[PDB]
Amino acid sequence: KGEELFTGVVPILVELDGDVNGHKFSVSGEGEGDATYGKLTLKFICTTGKLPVPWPTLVTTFVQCFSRYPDHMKQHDFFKSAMPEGYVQERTISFKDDGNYKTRAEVKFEGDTLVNRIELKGIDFKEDGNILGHKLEYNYNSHNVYITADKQKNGIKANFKIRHNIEDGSVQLADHYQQNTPIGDGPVLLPDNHYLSTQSALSKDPNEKRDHMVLLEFVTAAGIT
Numbered sequence: 001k002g003e004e005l006f007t008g009v010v011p012i013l014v015e016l017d018g019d020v021n022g023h024k025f026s027v028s029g030e031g032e033g034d035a036t037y038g039k040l041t042l043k044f045i046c047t048t049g050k051l052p053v054p055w056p057t058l059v060t061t062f063v064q065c066f067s068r069y070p071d072h073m074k075q076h077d078f079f080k081s082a083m084p085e086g087y088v089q090e091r092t093i094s095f096k097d098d099g100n101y102k103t104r105a106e107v108k109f110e111g112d113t114l115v116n117r118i119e120l121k122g123i124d125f126k127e128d129g130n131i132l133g134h135k136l137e138y139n140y141n142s143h144n145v146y147i148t149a150d151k152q153k154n155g156i157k158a159n160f161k162i163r164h165n166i167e168d169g170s171v172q173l174a175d176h177y178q179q180n181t182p183i184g185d186g187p188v189l190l191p192d193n194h195y196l197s198t199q200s201a202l203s204k205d206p207n208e209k210r211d212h213m214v215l216l217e218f219v220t221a222a223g224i225t
Contacts, residue, residue, distance in 0.1 A: 002083040003074065006035040006065065011113045012042060014062050020122030021099070021132065023052035029062055031215075033114065035080070038068030040217040045210050053122065054136040055213040056164055059200055060176060061091070061103050063116050064145075067196050067219040076191035076224065078147075078156045078180065084109040085184025087155070093162075096173040099125035108183060130164070130172045137165040140200040145178075149190045155181035156191065194223035 014029030031042035044055075044062060051058075065079035079087070086108025093101040105118040125132050141163050150157045158178035163171050182188050201216040 002080040003077065005083050005109065006033075006080055008036075009034050010066075012040075012063060012066075012116070013110070013113055014042065014044065014116045014118070016058070016062065016118040016120060018053075018120035018122070020053050020101070020120070021125045024048065025052055027051070027058070027062070029116075033063065033066035035066045035068060038066065038219045040066045040215070040219070042215045042217075043205065044213045044215070045208075046212070049211070051211050053131055054134055054164075055138065056136055056140055056202065057093075057095075057101075057131060057174065058120075058213075059140060059202075059215065060093070060162060060174075061101070061105070061118055061120060062215070063107060063114060064089075064196065064219065065107065065114065067221055069221040073194065073221050073224050075189060076194055076221065078189050078191055081187070081189040082180075082182040082184065085182065085186065087180050087182050090179045092177045094175045094177075095125075095129075095131060096175070098129045098131055098172075099123055106183065130166055135167050136172060137167055138202055139165055140202055141165070142197070142199045145196040145198060146193070147191060147195065148193055150179065150181075151190055153179070153181050154188060154190075155179065192224060194221055196220070197222050 016027040025048045029044040069077040089105040091103045102121045145160045162174040199218040203214045
């Protein structure tokens with residue numbers, strides 16, 4: 001019955017508590033998602049001051065239940081099936097020739113609002129690296145999130161490579177390993193191998209003086225005919 005909760009516009013709240021190399025920070029996000037069009041619109045604000053890591057590095061961490069699963073692929077939608085009770089989303093983001101982020105998130109409904117609560121821990125980052133040195137461009141490339149079933153843990157696994165554009169024209173690879181498990185005891189949909197075609201656009205709010213990020217994301221499931 002999870003899919004019925006996403007037929008219209010659903011309010012989203014994102015809350016993150018982070019620690020990267022001892023730099024403690026918090027981010028609060030607000031917006032909405034419309035799964036019918038695989039549309040996600042969110043505005044994030046760093047409530048502790050200046051964000052110690054570049055904004056693009058946190059995009060993937062900051063609600064795949066808003067992905068548009070075409071009608072013929074609806075039996076492969078794990079994300080919506082785990083709702084309203086939700087799911088736990090865990091990741092290990094390995095930045096090539098640099099450190100790593102270990103994230104634990106709980107995505108669930110709090111009333112009629114979809115909430116993403118995250119704890120992020122970043123370790124072994126280089127002081128003058130692409131991350132702590134803030135050498136990443138404020139943009140985002142299109143990617144494919146490859147999903148596979150994890151029948152033993154009653155959830156899914158995902159593997160993908162995020163390419164962050166560096167200011168000098170080079171690329172900072174951020175390899176993602178993901179694990180999602182349902183919070184509830186109800187039946188979930190265990191999918192066949194497929195992918196989520198993601199398109200992300202980053203922008204700024206001209207009237208906002210606080211360190212922020214406005215995200216517009218379009219996600220469509222594909223890979224099954």
